[PDB]
């Protein structure tokens, strides 16, 4: 109230050259900082049973620690790689995971009043589009850690990415066809993401429209069509080897086949 008085503003505006008064103003700002620092230091000392709830959100977001708020103008403070910063400026996926886990943990600790392990309760949690804002590194880890932090909780969820839907056994993932329910084929618990995409989502690993994909298809058609060196295998090989590189497990195999075909026309000359 004192520092925001209209009379003080009028006095400051009247005398711009107020270095003597500017010294007092900076002293007041230093007092501001000291008082705010003391008020915040009266906070970041101890905690309570909230520590168990806090441990739930440090596991899903590695590199996060020291979650408090600030008794200065209100904000929540995290520490990321020894860089203290506000929660309002975290990443979108980081905030999504933080809010989700914090809300579930709050619910679980309020339902269970007195327990040695409040965080493993019994209930139902439904998540829609779990892969909304998540990197593929977190997509193959979100569920195995979710079932571990929360043990006796059902987690019926919907997904839109192969990476998240290859950490669950094939008998517990449900596929909704045009009008009927179908079960996934065996081999999903630890299979390659390409296999999951090909036999669970009905999508080709190679985009069936690009020019390079069609060129590769024509090249694979020509190599096995008894003309392995009819100048067009040559043109397309010179293109694809330069594009993909000489070391990829799609053209190395086919070049090995071409070499075998080259060898096959050596002993047949005398025939």
């Amino acid at each position: 109230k004192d520092l925001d008085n209209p009379l003080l503003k009028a006095l400051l505006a009247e005398n711009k050259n107020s270095e003597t008064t500017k010294k007092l103003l900076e002293d007041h700002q230093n007092s501001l900082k000291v008082l705010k620092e003391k008020l915040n230091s009266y906070y970041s000392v101890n905690s309570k049973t909230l520590h168990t709830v806090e441990d739930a959100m440090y596991s899903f977001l590695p590199g996060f620690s020291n979650l408090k708020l600030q008794r200065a103008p209100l904000d929540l403070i995290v520490d990321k790689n020894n860089v203290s910063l506000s929660v309002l400026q975290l990443s979108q996926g980081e905030k999504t995971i933080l809010a989700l886990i914090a809300d579930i943990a709050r619910r679980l600790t309020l339902l269970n009043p007195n327990s040695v392990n409040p965080l493993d309760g019994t209930g139902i949690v439904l998540i829609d589009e779990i892969d909304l804002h998540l990197h593929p590194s977190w997509q193959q880890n979100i569920i195995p850690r979710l079932e571990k932090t929360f043990k006796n909780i059902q987690f019926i969820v919907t997904t839109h990415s192969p990476q998240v839907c290859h950490t669950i056994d094939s008998q517990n993932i449900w596929l909704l066809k045009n009008g009927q329910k179908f079960k996934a084929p065996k081999g999903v618990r630890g299979a390659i993401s390409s296999w999951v995409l090909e036999n669970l989502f009905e999508v080709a690993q190679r985009p069936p429209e690009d020019k390079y994909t069609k060129l590769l298809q024509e090249y694979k058609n020509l190599v096995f069509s008894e003309k392995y060196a009819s100048e067009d295998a040559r043109k397309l090989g010179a293109t694809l080897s330069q594009h993909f590189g000489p070391d990829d497990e799609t053209l190395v195999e086919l070049k090995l086949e071409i070499e075998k075909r080259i060898w096959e026309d050596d002993f047949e000359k005398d025939q």
Binding site: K80, V83, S84, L85, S86, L88, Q89, S91, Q92, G93, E94, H133, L134, H135, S137, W138
Partner: protein, 269 residues
């Protein structure tokens, strides 16, 4: 009369065909400041040619320079011009959203000075400063037909003397060029500036469509109006519903006066 050599060079460039070469030719012959006597007819010709030569050009962002922004200390990127798609890929927490947030706060300024007279826009807030530093700066170069426009937007904490002053030399140029082209010809195509944030998840709802017929009539139909609430994300659907109603109403209101006219011709026959 000894036309200056720079004037002759600009005339040669305009003869080859450029849009700025004739812009700085109808503002050199329309005032006494630039050093040549003002001729009105031969400045009007250059203005008309400058506006006519603007068609067929694409407006693209060429490069960008972040310094002490949200999470990047010093970043320099160059976007391809022969390619029409750039993709940012990275972990959640690296700063791909930061680059888009830096492309805006400059795209907002460009839209503001291309549509309105406000000459205002966004800026670097105190919470976006890199933790520990004092100064930040974002620089964007805008491209049009191979001729580039500079820009820089900066801030300094109010405890130290500012070491980076704002400058908007090229975007004022671009806005003036486009406004003059509109002035001479009301149907000159203008670039589109918009971003779609993740908040477009809840874009369509029954609440928006319920009162879409209760908005102002002059907010949707004019060239200079497809810029409001366009860089805020949240792809607008209420205004789209009003627009769709008006177009379907034009189809359902005309094409019946056409049928009535055909019936009138038959009756007159």
């Amino acid at each position: 009369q000894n036309l200056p050599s720079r004037i002759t060079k600009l005339i040669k460039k305009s003869e080859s065909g450029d849009f700025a070469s004739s812009y700085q030719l109808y503002k050199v012959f329309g005032s006494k400041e630039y050093g040549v006597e003002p001729d009105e007819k031969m400045s009007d010709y250059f203005k008309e040619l400058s506006a006519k030569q603007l068609e067929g050009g694409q407006l693209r962002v060429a490069d960008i320079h972040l310094e002490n922004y949200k999470g990047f200390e010093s970043l320099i990127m160059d976007f391809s011009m022969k390619k029409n798609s750039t993709i940012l890929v990275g972990n959640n927490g690296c700063g791909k959203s930061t680059i888009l947030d830096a492309i805006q706060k400059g795209l907002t300024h460009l839209s503001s000075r291309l549509s309105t007279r406000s000459h205002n826009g966004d800026g670097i807030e105190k919470h976006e400063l890199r933790k520990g530093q004092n100064y930040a700066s974002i620089a964007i170069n805008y491209d049009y037909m191979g001729i580039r426009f500079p820009m820089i937007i900066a801030t300094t904490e109010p405890g130290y003397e500012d070491r980076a002053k704002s400058n908007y030399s090229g975007i004022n140029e671009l806005g003036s060029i486009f406004k003059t082209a509109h002035s001479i010809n009301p149907n000159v195509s203008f670039p589109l500036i918009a971003m779609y944030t993740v908040e477009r998840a809840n874009d369509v709802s029954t609440r928006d469509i319920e009162n879409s017929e209760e908005i102002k009539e002059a907010q949707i139909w004019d060239k200079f109006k497809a810029y409001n609430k366009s860089l805020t994300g949240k792809a607008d659907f209420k205004l789209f519903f009003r627009w769709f109603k008006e177009l379907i109403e034009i189809e359902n209101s005309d094409n019946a006066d056409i049928t009535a006219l055909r019936a009138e011709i038959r009756a007159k026959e």
